[PDB]
Design a protein around this ligand. Structure first.
Ligand SMILES: [Fe+3]
Length: 53
């Protein structure tokens, strides 16, 4: 699992940590995050994120 960054605000989704406050548990791959989840920082959707390669 890769980290992904919100290209609008620079928030990094790290799959080891998930986003548990918003119901994304540690170990969720980004592609498995429900498609209505938004960046916890700026609130934009998933389509503004890019795999950190
Ligand atoms: Fe963001």
């Amino acid at each position: 699992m890769k980290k992904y960054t919100c290209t609008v605000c620079g928030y990094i989704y790290n799959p080891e940590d998930g986003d548990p406050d918003n119901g994304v548990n540690p170990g969720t791959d980004f592609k498995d995050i429900p498609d209505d989840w938004v960046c916890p920082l700026c609130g934009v959707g998933k389509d503004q994120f890019e795999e950190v390669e």
